[PDB]
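Recall from the previous chapter that SMILES is a line notation for molecules. Here it describes WSH.
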Amino acid sequence: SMNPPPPETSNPNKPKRQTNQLQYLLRVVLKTLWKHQFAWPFQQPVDAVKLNLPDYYKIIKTPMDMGTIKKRLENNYYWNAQECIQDFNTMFTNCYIYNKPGDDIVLMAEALEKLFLQKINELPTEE
Ligand SMILES: Cc1nnc2n1-c1ccccc1C(c1ccccc1)=N[C@H]2NC(=O)OCc1ccccc1
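With both inputs in hand, we obtain:
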């Protein structure tokens, strides 16, 4: 079994900025989710080899996780908030696509997503 390379967190010819919205996504959104009791399965890419999920990366073709998002935010990888918000939504969607309703991992994703939605509701206006 083999894992794919992780999503990129560095790319010098990708345009990027530091905006107040992106600062909020790190300081408030990422930090809130990262500290949650249910964050741990989402803190790094899915290790399909160790978890014995040989079909994971057949089904999930756009993987995303908070470890990647954290590095992207710390490395100022993004151009805008929308890009980062998309990464979070991809992470949650992947979980719901791969797993069954009521599964522990789905309940965990749902708890994190609720908080994500609460925080993103107060995304500040662009300065
Ligand atoms: C993130 C994410 N998205 N899906 C899955 N994780 C995940 C990522 C990383 C780690 C665990 C998980 C858990 C999980 C997490 C918490 C509780 C239940 C399940 N479940 C994984 N899914 C699955 O079928 O694992 C079977 C399995 C589960 C565990 C071991 C072997 C085989």
